[PDB]
């Protein structure tokens, strides 16, 4: 569809006082597109949605859509562990001109499969734009089974794919069998994007592409062209950065990395915190390996 | 000191339309106190806080405090994964007349120990009433270590105890060694409340006490008196209900059980859902075993 | 029957050349009994059974029985992931004059519940002395459910009890409900022995009792008398040693500790290795806290 | 070391009395080679090594080598949680004429990284044929880190590759970075063989290839040729069988499947047991899908 390739899970930059840095964000989103990013996810996991006010949440989406200017799809984060709240966020994303919404499995309250089916069927029926399921047991603890995901694709037209952050690559095969070959599967993990694409993925909603949008865009292009030899060469270049970016909790690593490129301030909101020196040095080394700094 | 014994993690009742059933809640809170419940936690995990609006959240606390009428402590749930939001909730709980606040580890965003330290030190310094740390890796994934908990009690006077939902009983011993004997340890799990108290717990923030407040009050009294033989007799009576209540996701089991006593409607907010018939029958059997119904 | 209280999971001492140190072992088993140990398990987890030859395996059991001289029960380790091998080990233990056998859940090959039922029913029917199930998911990965345990106690006369190393104290309650109050439950973990007994345990197959047999014997006696207040005072004394002994893989910690008492050489067989200096210092400090050394 | 492609983790057939079925095994090993299997692992996890006597262990290796007749490499299973035992097994495998040995991380006794280093360095130094590390946390619980694996490749000439059963595909990238590009990485999981190869794997030590040697050989050939579109078509054909074969514990599924092809008796040694009828029907359906039976 339009949902393929390297799609950046955008950091939300803050200034030296913790306010939304709209100026850095505008320049950053433009840089991303110039470097070959195929899509943008504002206010996701990596955007520190939890610490944004309701107004900041709306504003980051609006600015993201305005700078994109139709050049690349905007898949707005619209996640909540409250079905009524996720409806409101998804409708506001659509009204604001989002191309699609990314809707996480409810976190903290740990619903069963019936509850997941109800949550996703009610959210997608509230809107007219495509919905991507965001399955991340490592943050929501519960796990949408391929069977539940199949029931939702069968029953709901606008459920078009998954951000699959299970890190269990056999799921790509099971989801392909049950949801079909047209079901849009996007890696939710940078380090396993390569194998994810071999099992039938068509892209990655990426943290690393915040830092290396061009190499990540080329890596994804290589996978979609079937040039796995080139993709593996690019994996050898990026894997140190895939690893170093996650030594500390996301998006501490990415925000340090983007500050080291001079593009944002190294600032996060409690309970997220700046990385220690030792992490910062492993991220610098990984950025040299990848050729992003001399 | 007032934080001892059986403390009910209150369900939030909804009517046949999903509105706050204030009438059922008032009668329920009163029944709980009459049956010997030693404290109340409104808008905690079992209260479906995620699906309450800001106004419903305020109202459940206000009504809880009003009905309590100083007869037992009210420990208001005041959790967020956003430090600024948790400050605002804790201050509002204090202004409303709460005796203390229960503040969960940030869920979803997975901060490190420094982030936890910052979160809890800023929340407790924003207020003048006691704070209880709520450590629940099974919902927030990350885990406040005894060491980090010790640092917070050492540095912050008004951090007075923990709701410990780790299910790892050796933590009670480690928290007692590092946080001290005066540190108030309350079981976050019904089924291991007994062993929890043997290691130095002085009570339980309980789901089962929603259904069997009097037997739960006696069980806790027996532990605090040192009559572990009586506590074990009461465990033989309560354990099938401890188990049957959690066959399906909390608080679906409890809400069915309380509807079977005629005290609420069997109604939850998406993505939480009513239990299957088979579960309902295992909860009826466990309630018969405990002598709550014929 | 006489399976109660502090039962030592004996280390197998090696000399400076890696041979079985039979002289240190005979003095150690005698010391254990003199200090009030209520039972002995030779060639278990803590005995490095995997690195003993078939002849060394037979000899450690024989020496244990010879020194015991009927003063305390010997529960010989007779564990294998091969049912035919476990039959042969249990029969050899019985012929050698063991009072009972400790038989682990098969490790590595990960059988289902039917396979566990078959394993334990065939081994216990091969012998005429009591059998204790050893349930340790932390080493064998699979987990005998309370239901499977129930089936085995119900159907096999000589299956009398469990060494429960799940660390999940709600299992003691579930096993008591299904297997009955007369079913002999022994903690498989030192740090949760206390809570284990509160839920209906009658003792602990202990690592710590290798080092502090007398304090561990008194702690267990206190629990069996219903003096949980005294048991908790003894927990305050023992918990730093419970922790320091397991900083590094069992039995590295215990073997260093027993060498520091002058009772064995600090020698293990590959792939087990001696502890680091730093660990050794945390073990010394824990031994001072407990009053075992000046 | 042309250890590449589909390498079968051979079942050990037993007759209706539980004895080694040498006649079925000879015909099976020959069939495997005729169908394009590139290598053979006798007496591995899938061969029920735990339940083989010392003489049966030697015999299955000897028959495997004799039937192979130099046509494909034989990588003999030589695993133990005892370093001295693993030495003896590896030397005997070499004396019998094995091309290489597969040596599992010690199970049950849970050594640290020093213990793993010592275990593998002593085993490989005892022999003069190549050694493949078998890293399987799902059976041994402990996990050789890429750093420990790199130390062993740096220090030990004959450590040539890994059977990687972590199911964590980012390990392939990390092992390639630290152990180098010539380090032979073989998938330890059938379901993720495809992505494993995309990250730099050159084959799979396979369970499924017991049942579909030809399709598994083609799948691996497609990956090694860089035809990932063909490999993915073959994944769509094999994945239901990759799943159905592991509904019940390995090798109960494979043994039923091979009995349904008429090639062995459906017979396992305790504690492994024949699959239920229900599983057998899901395996039949998966075998129909793959075109192995009508």
Curated annotation (Swiss-Prot), chains A, B, C, D:
InterPro entries: Aldolase_TIM, DapA, DapA-like, Schiff_base-form_aldolases_AS. It comes from the Bacteria. It is found in: Cytoplasm. One of its GO terms (biological process) is diaminopimelate biosynthetic process. It is an enzyme of class 4 (lyase). Belongs to the DapA family. This is 4-hydroxy-tetrahydrodipicolinate synthase. It comes from Brucella suis biovar 1 (strain 1330).
């Amino acid at each position: 569809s339009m949902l393929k390739g390297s799609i950046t899970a955008l950091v939300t930059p803050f200034d030296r006082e913790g306010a939304f840095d709209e100026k850095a964000f505008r320049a950053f989103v433009n840089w991303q597109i110039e470097e070959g990013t195929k899509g943008l996810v504002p206010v996701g996991t990596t955007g520190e949605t939890p610490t944004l006010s309701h107004d900041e949440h709306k504003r980051v989406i609006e600015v993201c859509i305005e700078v994109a200017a139709g050049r690349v799809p905007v898949i707005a984060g619209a996640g909540s562990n409250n079905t009524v709240e996720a409806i409101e966020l998804a409708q506001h994303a659509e009204k604001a001109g989002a191309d699609a919404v990314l809707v996480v499995t409810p976190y903290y309250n740990k619903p069963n499969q019936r509850g997941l089916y109800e949550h996703f069927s009610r959210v997608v029926r509230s809107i007219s734009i495509p919905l991507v399921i965001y399955n991340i047991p490592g943050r929501s603890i519960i796990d949408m089974t391929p069977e539940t995901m199949g029931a939702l694709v069968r029953d709901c037209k606008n459920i078009v794919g998954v951000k699959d952050a299970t890190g269990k690559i056999e799921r790509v095969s099971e989801q392909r069998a049950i949801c079909g070959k047209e079901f849009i599967q996007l890696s939710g993990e940078d380090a396993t994007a390569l194998g994810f694409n071999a099992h039938g993925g068509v892209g990655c909603i990426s943290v690393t592409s915040n830092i290396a949008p061009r190499l990540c865009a080329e890596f994804q292009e290589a996978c979609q062209a079937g040039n796995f030899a080139k993709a593996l060469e690019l994996q050898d270049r990026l894997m140190p950065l895939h690893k170093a970016l996650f030594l500390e909790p996301n998006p501490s690593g990415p925000k340090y990395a983007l500050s080291r490129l001079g593009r944002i301030e190294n600032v996060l909101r409690s309970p997220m915190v700046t990385i220690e020196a030792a992490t910062a040095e492993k991220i610098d080394h990984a950025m040299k390996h990848a050729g992003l700094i001399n």
